[PDB]
Amino acid sequence: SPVRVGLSVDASALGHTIPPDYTGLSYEQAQMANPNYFSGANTQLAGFLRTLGRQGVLRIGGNTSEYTFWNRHAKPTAADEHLAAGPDKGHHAAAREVITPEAVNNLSEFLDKTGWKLIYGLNLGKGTPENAADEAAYVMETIGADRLLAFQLGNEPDLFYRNGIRPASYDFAAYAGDWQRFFTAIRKRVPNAPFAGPDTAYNTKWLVPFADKFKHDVKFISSHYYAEGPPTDPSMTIERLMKPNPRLLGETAGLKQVEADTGLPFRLTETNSCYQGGKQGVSDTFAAALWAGDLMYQQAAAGSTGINFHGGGYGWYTPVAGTPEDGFIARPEYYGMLLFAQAGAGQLLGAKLTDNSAAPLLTAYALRGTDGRTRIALFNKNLDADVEVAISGVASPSGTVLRLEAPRADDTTDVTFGGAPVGASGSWSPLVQEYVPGHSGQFVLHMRKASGALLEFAKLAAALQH
Ligand SMILES: O=C(O)[C@H]1O[C@@H](Oc2ccc([N+](=O)[O-])cc2[N+](=O)[O-])[C@H](F)[C@@H](O)[C@@H]1O
Ligand SMILES: O=C(O)[C@H]1O[C@@H](Oc2ccc([N+](=O)[O-])cc2[N+](=O)[O-])[C@H](F)[C@@H](O)[C@@H]1O
Numbered sequence: 001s002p003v004r005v006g007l008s009v010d011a012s013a014l015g016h017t018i019p020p021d022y023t024g025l026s027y028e029q030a031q032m033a034n035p036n037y038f039s040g041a042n043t044q045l046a047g048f049l050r051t052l053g054r055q056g057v058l059r060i061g062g063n064t065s066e067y068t069f070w071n072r073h074a075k076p077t078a079a080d081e082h083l084a085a086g087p088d089k090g091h092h093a094a095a096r097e098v099i100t101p102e103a104v105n106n107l108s109e110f111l112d113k114t115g116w117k118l119i120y121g122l123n124l125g126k127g128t129p130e131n132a133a134d135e136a137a138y139v140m141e142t143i144g145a146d147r148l149l150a151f152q153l154g155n156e157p158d159l160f161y162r163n164g165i166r167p168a169s170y171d172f173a174a175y176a177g178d179w180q181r182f183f184t185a186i187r188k189r190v191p192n193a194p195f196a197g198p199d200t201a202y203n204t205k206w207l208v209p210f211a212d213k214f215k216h217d218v219k220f221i222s223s224h225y226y227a228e229g230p231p232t233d234p235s236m237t238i239e240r241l242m243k244p245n246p247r248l249l250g251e252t253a254g255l256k257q258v259e260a261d262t263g264l265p266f267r268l269t270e271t272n273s274c275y276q277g278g279k280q281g282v283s284d285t286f287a288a289a290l291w292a293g294d295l296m297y298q299q300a301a302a303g304s305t306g307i308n309f310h311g312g313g314y315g316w317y318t319p320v321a322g323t324p325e326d327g328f329i330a331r332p333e334y335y336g337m338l339l340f341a342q343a344g345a346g347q348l349l350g351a352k353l354t355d356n357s358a359a360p361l362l363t364a365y366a367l368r369g370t371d372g373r374t375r376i377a378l379f380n381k382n383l384d385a386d387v388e389v390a391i392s393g394v395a396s397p398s399g400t401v402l403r404l405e406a407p408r409a410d411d412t413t414d415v416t417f418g419g420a421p422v423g424a425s426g427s428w429s430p431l432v433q434e435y436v437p438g439h440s441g442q443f444v445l446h447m448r449k450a451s452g453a454l455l456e457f458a459k460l461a462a463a464l465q466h
């Protein structure tokens with residue numbers, strides 16, 4: 001028998017706004033070594049991005065951003081024509097790669113085909129300030145001011161002290177030294193160069209200090225988040241992924257603090273289910289779809305202005321997998337992002353769960369969409385309990401439900417949303433839609449264990465609208 005829970009929506013309790021560019025992805029800077037990947041001719045990948053959002057952000061950085069060197073005078077053939085750069089596995093220094101001018105040109109075409117904006121990593125770990133300045137100049141010229149959201153100076157500088165990029169004594173102080181030096185060189189060459197940071201791995205203590213020290217220099221504050229790791233650790237399981245944890249609590253507190261204290265927006269610029277490249281049998285499963293869609297909403301509710309799920313290649317946690325030669329496919333995690341895409345932008349509303357102690361991992365978010373229609377995204381992350389949700393507070397005669405499903409939580413395939421898989425180049429239309437009738441704002445929705453749902457409610461009295 002289902003666990004019977006209440007969801008009270010309060011349309012008068014307004015929360016944060018979800019902007020049209022909330023969604024996004026993160027990729028390794030090393031991907032720039034192959035100009036055919038982010039390219040106008042890569043119509044398949046662009047299609048997958050357009051389905052994730054009419055607007056969104058592509059972030060390029062990661063562990064490889066310390067090992068990639070802009071070379072304005074490269075032979076075009078320096079390029080690795082075949083490279084599909086998967087998430088860095090974080091065991092040792094990445095292979096050193098050059099970025100060519102044509103890679104930047106093709107990145108511009110790709111952004112033009114997708115309608116997305118760009119966050120671009122610069123090499124503060126091993127590069128010089130002069131080369132960063134030159135790189136920045138070419139990117140700004142090529143990408144354009146309209147599409148370049150920010151440069152970022154180093155990736156996860158809070159781990160430099162332990163990974164060898166710096167000595168064991170490197171700390172916030174020294175980073176702020178490094179950052180200032182690069183910033184000044186870049187701005188001399190590119191007066192309108194925009195910035196974000198500190199792009200930290202986990203260390204929230206760097207956030208307010210960074211935001212305070214560089215308040216007039218940056219557009220937003222950034223940090224990262226991984227639910228689990230390392231992948232070889234047997235405690236890192238699907239069930240664990242469905243649950244909050246102290247790191248998430250700390251990141252969430254960290255983002256609220258920086259926004260409260262400084263008034264600067266926050267963006268989660270690198271995130272996925274398990275670090276060091278993800279975990280087989282967890283990161284590549286239907287559970288990751290529930291995990292990722294729920295994370296997008298939880299972060300927005302806390303005040304995050306956007307997100308970037310890391311990926312690339314055929315990485316265990318990649319939302320999109322593939323290569324320009326063999327084609328691209330949506331992995332299970334993509335479908336959690338797709339639910340969010342389908343819900344769209346708007347303003348979050350009060351929505352409280354009650355009688356839910358026997359179904360503690362169910363989450364729900366109500367949104368007043370741009371078009372004025374109410375949506376509710378639910379994630380029954382309970383692996384073993386079906387739920388029956390008594391929804392109230394919804395001023396609508398009826399809704400449709402689109403289901404996020406797979407036959408088992410650990411399935412690496414068989415994932416559908418709205419009764420359909422995603423096809424080639426991000427193609428997707430709902431094929432199964434269930435009507436839910438309401439009265440006095442009350443609706444009842446059953447959800448199987450380990451499933452999700454998006455409810456879209458009809459306007460009142462709008463049957464004759466043009
Ligand atoms: O030189 C090595 O192989 C060195 O690699 C360290 O690993 C890293 C170095 C740099 C980065 N990074 O810029 O992101 C990341 C890693 N990493 O996450 O593995 C090793 F820690 C060190 O033992 C090794 O000597
Ligand atoms: O790690 C290294 O290879 C070495 O690289 C230098 O930085 C560069 C390498 C290559 C180019 N380029 O192909 O135009 C440019 C730079 N650069 O001016 O940043 C570092 F300076 C050096 O410390 C590092 O050991």
Ligand SMILES: O=[N+]([O-])c1ccc(O)c([N+](=O)[O-])c1
Nearest residue numbers: 398399400433434435457458
């Ligand atoms: O269940 N449906 O496919 C469906 C379609 C259009 C609709 O307008 C509604 N509705 O009124 O909520 C439901």
Ligand SMILES: *[C@H]1O[C@H](C(=O)O)[C@@H](O)[C@H](O)[C@H]1F
Nearest residue numbers: 062063087088090275276277
């Ligand atoms: C963010 O963390 C990722 C991971 O550990 O999976 C890496 O792939 C990425 O290079 C790093 F920036």
